[PDB]
Write an enzyme that holds these catalytic residues in place. Structure first.
Site, PDB file in Angstrom:
ATOM      1  N   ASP A  22     -30.090  -9.662  -8.998  1.00  0.00           N
ATOM      2  CA  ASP A  22     -30.918 -10.848  -8.930  1.00  0.00           C
ATOM      3  C   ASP A  22     -30.693 -11.315 -10.439  1.00  0.00           C
ATOM      4  O   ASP A  22     -30.552 -10.684 -11.407  1.00  0.00           O
ATOM      5  CB  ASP A  22     -32.413 -10.450  -9.144  1.00  0.00           C
ATOM      6  CG  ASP A  22     -33.297 -11.715  -9.154  1.00  0.00           C
ATOM      7  OD1 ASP A  22     -32.539 -12.778  -9.255  1.00  0.00           O
ATOM      8  OD2 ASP A  22     -34.394 -11.461  -9.085  1.00  0.00           O
ATOM      9  N   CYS A  25     -32.757 -10.822 -13.436  1.00  0.00           N
ATOM     10  CA  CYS A  25     -33.090  -9.327 -13.821  1.00  0.00           C
ATOM     11  C   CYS A  25     -32.243  -9.174 -15.254  1.00  0.00           C
ATOM     12  O   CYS A  25     -31.007  -9.388 -15.151  1.00  0.00           O
ATOM     13  CB  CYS A  25     -32.949  -8.604 -12.741  1.00  0.00           C
ATOM     14  SG  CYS A  25     -33.280  -6.782 -13.233  1.00  0.00           S
ATOM     15  N   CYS A  28     -29.724  -6.650 -14.040  1.00  0.00           N
ATOM     16  CA  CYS A  28     -28.587  -6.896 -13.735  1.00  0.00           C
ATOM     17  C   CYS A  28     -27.497  -7.875 -14.437  1.00  0.00           C
ATOM     18  O   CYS A  28     -26.240  -7.834 -14.049  1.00  0.00           O
ATOM     19  CB  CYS A  28     -28.969  -8.059 -12.331  1.00  0.00           C
ATOM     20  SG  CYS A  28     -29.994  -7.149 -11.085  1.00  0.00           S
ATOM     21  N   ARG A  52     -35.554 -11.751  -6.184  1.00  0.00           N
ATOM     22  CA  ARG A  52     -37.229 -10.897  -6.094  1.00  0.00           C
ATOM     23  C   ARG A  52     -38.176 -12.194  -5.815  1.00  0.00           C
ATOM     24  O   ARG A  52     -39.234 -11.685  -5.209  1.00  0.00           O
ATOM     25  CB  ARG A  52     -37.448 -10.263  -7.458  1.00  0.00           C
ATOM     26  CG  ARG A  52     -36.355  -9.232  -7.626  1.00  0.00           C
ATOM     27  CD  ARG A  52     -36.719  -8.513  -9.052  1.00  0.00           C
ATOM     28  NE  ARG A  52     -36.189  -9.547 -10.210  1.00  0.00           N
ATOM     29  CZ  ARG A  52     -36.408  -9.454 -11.356  1.00  0.00           C
ATOM     30  NH1 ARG A  52     -36.856  -8.089 -11.804  1.00  0.00           N
ATOM     31  NH2 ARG A  52     -36.157 -10.394 -12.265  1.00  0.00           N
TER      32      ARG A  52
END
Ligand code: CL
Ligand code: CL
Ligand code: CL
Length: 142
Positions: A22, A25, A28, A52
């Site tokens: 994502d 994130c 990430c 998400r």
């Protein structure tokens, strides 16, 4: 399915992981900033989208623009490490379907957060790990 991934192929690959990611994130982004470290240890990283927010929110449209850019690898980096807005270069209707399919796959596999790293044997790492520790996890399982 297995053909809609963004692959960072590692020279002399010894392991290959599948990462549900994502772009919003923070881990990430940390993971994508370490792709060169993964490849240097012989780890191929293959990205699958998993917003998400959901498969239809604003994050899904940004990740759809990444998959629909002329250079999705550069679009991923500009969105994660630089927080730049990505504009689709191709018909985004093609990629919006892919993003929704990626989310449906991650929901089918039952992931509960990003980044979701799947190992070659099918086992899963519950989040980001640096290249050395991820290599140790692969050698202990594969
Ligand atoms: Cl690719
Ligand atoms: Cl949604
Ligand atoms: Cl289809």
């Amino acid at each position: 399915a297995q053909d809609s991934m963004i692959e960072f192929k590692a020279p002399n690959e010894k392991y290959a992981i599948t990462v549900f990611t994502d772009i919003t994130c923070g881990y990430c982004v940390r993971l994508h900033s370490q792709i060169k470290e993964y490849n240097d240890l012989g780890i191929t990283v293959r990205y699958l989208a998993y917003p998400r927010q959901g498969p239809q929110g604003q994050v899904a449209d940004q990740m759809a623009a990444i998959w629909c850019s002329n250079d999705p690898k550069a679009a991923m980096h500009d969105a994660k490490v630089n927080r730049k807005t990505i504009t689709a270069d191709k018909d985004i209707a093609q990629c919006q379907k892919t993003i929704a399919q990626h989310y449906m796959l991650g929901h089918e596999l039952g992931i509960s957060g990003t980044p979701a790293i799947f190992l070659p044997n099918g086992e899963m790492v519950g989040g980001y790990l640096p290249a050395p520790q991820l290599l140790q996890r692969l050698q202990a399982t594969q």
